[PDB]
Design a protein around this ligand. Structure first.
Ligand SMILES: *[C@H]1O[C@H](CO)[C@@H](O[C@H]2O[C@H](CO)[C@@H](O[C@H]3O[C@H](CO[C@H]4O[C@H](CO)[C@@H](O)[C@H](O)[C@@H]4O)[C@@H](O)[C@H](O)[C@@H]3O)[C@H](O)[C@H]2NC(C)=O)[C@H](O)[C@H]1NC(C)=O
Ligand SMILES: *[C@@H]1O[C@H](CO)[C@@H](O[C@H]2O[C@H](CO)[C@@H](O[C@@H]3O[C@H](CO)[C@@H](O)[C@H](O)[C@@H]3O)[C@H](O)[C@H]2NC(C)=O)[C@H](O)[C@H]1NC(C)=O
Length: 284
């Protein structure tokens, strides 16, 4: 039968729906045939190991807007066919054991936005070869470890805006060959490594606005062969010698770019680097 507080139906997909009830625990007895489980908007604070193990055909699991504080490392064991997992809006989660998503080889969408996440642990996204959308915005991330996304060969959207990231290291984005949109705005980025985007050959959208960049190496932009939309506004660009390479790259860029306002020298304050003549910049 259907557990209390839940409503169950069989078509078009077997669904067990128990959202917005104020539940503290995962209902016991969720139909093993469930393809979709909706538990969002409750007051669940812990997801025990094998909480959904019997539901081998589960493809959609919503646990967003709960009060998750801890997810057992084996919470999603048995869910090899899982395609969409929404854990967003659990602001006190703070950390996810790095083995939590291992084995989710069919996962296409993973929502971890607004989870107070402080770090991306070793192997957190290992083996998620089918992942296409990864939402990590509005968390508490401050660093991007090397190769964190290297197995995400099919990822097309990576949202990291609204965190406190201060640097983009050389190997942060290795392996993201299918990436189409990379959102890094509203962070504290002060430095981008010259080879930070080496593998992003299909990237079409790059947002870096609202950060702390005073300069950006053109070598980082050089391999972005498909780039079409670039936002660099709202950074304290210094328009002296150091802006000459970026100025030349902006002249060559055939896509769409935002204004690139100079913060210094006063003479050029407020002026868009794109609209200046190289004659306007101090020489090196
Ligand atoms: C979730 O995963 C599957 C959903 O697609 C589902 O598959 C199986 O479902 C039945 C579980 O016992 C199993 O046996 C039933 O069907 C047998 C006859 O086969 C029928 O179904 C096939 C499906 O391809 C068709 O050729 C045709 O409809 C045929 O008549 C009989 O023994 C009984 O009718 C029995 O009830 C199915 O064979 C099997 N389906 C498939 C596609 O392989 C899983 O059961 C679900 N997992 C769980 C445990 O919830
Ligand atoms: C990452 O995306 C890949 C590209 O979309 C995807 O590749 C494969 O996608 C399907 C699913 O396996 C394959 O389709 C097969 O096609 C062959 C005919 O050549 C037949 O065996 C049958 O028709 C089958 O559907 C694609 O061929 C294949 N794409 C290519 C060209 O490599 C990956 O599966 C995906 N990664 C993950 C883990 O989901």
């Amino acid at each position: 039968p259907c557990p209390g507080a839940c409503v169950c139906y069989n078509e078009p997909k077997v669904t067990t729906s128990c959202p917005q009830q104020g539940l503290q625990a995962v209902p016991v007895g969720i139909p093993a045939a469930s393809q979709r489980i909706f538990l969002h908007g409750n007051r669940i604070s812990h997801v025990p190991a094998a909480s959904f193990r019997a539901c081998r055909n589960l493809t959609i699991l919503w646990l967003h807007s709960n009060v998750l504080a801890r997810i057992d490392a084996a919470a999603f064991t048995g869910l090899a066919l899982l395609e969409q997992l929404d854990l967003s809006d659990n602001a006190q989660l703070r950390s996810v054991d790095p083995a939590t998503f291992h084995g989710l080889g069919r996962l296409h969408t993973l929502h971890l936005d607004r989870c107070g996440l402080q770090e991306l642990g070793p192997g957190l996204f290992r083996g998620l070869a089918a992942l296409q959308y990864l939402y990590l915005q509005d968390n508490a991330l401050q660093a991007l470890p090397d190769d964190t996304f290297r197995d995400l060969g099919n990822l097309t959207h990576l949202f990291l805006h609204g965190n406190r990231i201060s640097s983009v290291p050389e190997r942060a984005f290795r392996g993201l060959h299918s990436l189409d949109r990379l959102l890094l705005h509203q962070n504290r980025v002060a430095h981008v490594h010259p080879h930070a985007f080496r593998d992003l050959g299909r990237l079409m959208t790059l947002y870096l606005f609202a950060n702390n960049l005073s300069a950006l190496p053109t070598e980082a932009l050089a391999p972005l062969r498909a780039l079409q939309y670039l936002r660099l506004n709202d950074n304290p660009w210094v328009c002296d010698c150091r802006a000459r390479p970026l100025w030349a790259w902006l002249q060559k860029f055939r896509g769409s770019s935002s204004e690139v306002p100079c913060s210094l020298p006063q003479r050029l304050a407020g002026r868009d680097l794109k609209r200046l003549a190289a004659n306007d910049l101090q020489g090196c």
